[PDB]
């Protein structure tokens, strides 16, 4: 199956460069174009550039030659390089494969990688339990606090538990660090018996934390 996956740095300091790897599978890069498109948080989409099956590139002029793209067909990797990053370059970056009928529409996308342009330091999360009340549907969760930059992900019981999960948008606190909660409602009856573990990943800091959540 056609798949693309980006790997990016999380944080870039202002004026420095961004490198993102798009690893693909399911198709040959010698035969399809791959494009880069980005989306600032909460905003719309901006096409950045493409590299043709054959190696040629074309770039959006708005990027003022700061952006280049290269690839390694043999290892199924496409690489975005953009110099001189500033605030407007904070965004989720996607690589995408275009259709063949080439059509510049984008039939397959990677999950994207968020790049935050900031002079601050990466900081991993503390993960605290939201323990289900002893006082029948019960709620429990994990509070994921004090990390930077975004994002984190949270799954429960390694993905086994998905139903009734709600992971909220993070909020940036005055300290410049983010805080997020993830909760789930479950039957009271499972609490003595069911084990509930929130699995937290913060890729910018290469940090993973599991947290067993229990009645106190």
């Amino acid at each position: 199956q056609v798949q693309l996956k980006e790997s990016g740095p999380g944080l870039v300091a202002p004026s420095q460069s961004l490198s993102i790897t798009c690893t693909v599978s399911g198709f040959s890069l010698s035969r399809y174009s791959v494009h880069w498109v980005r989306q600032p948080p909460g905003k719309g989409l901006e096409w950045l550039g493409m590299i043709w099956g054959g190696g040629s590139t074309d770039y959006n002029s708005a990027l003022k030659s700061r952006l280049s793209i290269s690839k390694d067909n043999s290892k199924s990797q496409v690489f975005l390089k953009m110099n001189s990053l500033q605030t407007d370059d904070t965004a989720m970056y996607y690589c995408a494969r275009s259709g063949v009928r080439a059509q510049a529409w984008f039939a397959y996308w990677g999950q994207g990688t968020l790049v935050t342009v900031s002079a601050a330091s990466t900081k991993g999360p503390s993960v605290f339990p939201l323990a289900p009340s002893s006082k029948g549907t019960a709620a429990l969760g994990c509070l994921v606090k004090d990390y930077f930059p975004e994002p984190v992900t949270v799954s429960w019981n390694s993905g086994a538990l998905t139903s009734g999960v709600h992971t909220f948008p993070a909020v940036l606190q005055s300290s410049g660090l983010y805080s997020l909660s993830s909760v789930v409602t479950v039957p009271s009856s499972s609490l003595g018996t069911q084990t509930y573990i929130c699995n937290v990943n913060h890729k910018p800091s290469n940090t993973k934390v599991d947290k067993k959540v229990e009645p106190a």
């Binding site: 494009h35 719309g44 959006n60 510049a104 939201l130 709600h166 992971t167």
Partner: protein
């Protein structure tokens, strides 16, 4: 460059309704227009290309029409899982450009929240800070007022909240509010209450705990 304009950032509809979203190009782009669906937390998904062709695997309820400058994407019977931001894009000439998106939002019947309050963990208290969290779970409409009280006194300025997108099955929102205090302040007070006002509640609901009890 060509500008693609969607006239509305938001479109209200209800499950089973037909809804149409318009996108207008600033230059004649023949039929070279694609439409994407971007669900919360996911990348855009291609639905339509060359104005009216469905992509492989795309449900029949999604169609597109138009040619020249005026394009329309239509969902003939809105499903609950169709909550998303829809974007048009021209694939007529470089640079490829997208419309600014239209978020569909689903009207449904009133649902009161189920409210839960959580004390800070003793783990966190070691750290010098206390976060108290109140969860409003699966309610509709969006509008809700969460008031924190600590020993019966109304708080202000020391909470933040966030709200999920409409749920893909039941169309509800959920909301988290977090009250943040220093450990010494948290230890000095006794009663922590989250008071919730919502159209679905005949009067406000309060969930509370007593520190240490």
């Amino acid at each position: 460059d060509i500008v693609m304009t969607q006239s509305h950032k938001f479109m209200s509809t209800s499950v089973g309704d037909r809804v149409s979203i318009t996108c207008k190009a600033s230059q004649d782009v023949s039929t070279a227009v694609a439409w994407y669906q971007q669900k919360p937390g996911q990348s855009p998904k291609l639905l339509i290309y060359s104005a009216s062709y469905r992509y492989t695997g795309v449900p029949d309820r999604f169609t597109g029409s138009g040619s020249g400058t005026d394009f329309t994407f239509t969902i003939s019977s809105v499903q609950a899982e169709d909550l998303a931001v829809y974007y048009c894009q021209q694939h007529y000439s470089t640079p490829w450009t997208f419309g600014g998106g239209t978020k569909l939002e689903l009207k449904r019947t009133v649902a009161a929240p189920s409210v839960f309050i959580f004390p800070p963990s003793d783990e966190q208290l070691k750290s010098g800070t206390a976060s108290v969290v109140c969860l409003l779970n699966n309610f509709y409409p969006r509008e809700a007022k969460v008031q924190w009280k600590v020993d019966n006194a109304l708080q202000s300025g020391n909470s933040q909240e966030s709200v999920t997108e409409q749920d893909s099955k039941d169309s509800t929102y959920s909301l988290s509010s977090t009250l943040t205090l220093s450990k010494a302040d948290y230890e000095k007070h006794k009663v922590y209450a989250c008071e919730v006002t919502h159209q679905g509640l005949s009067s406000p609901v309060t969930k509370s705990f007593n520190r240490g009890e």
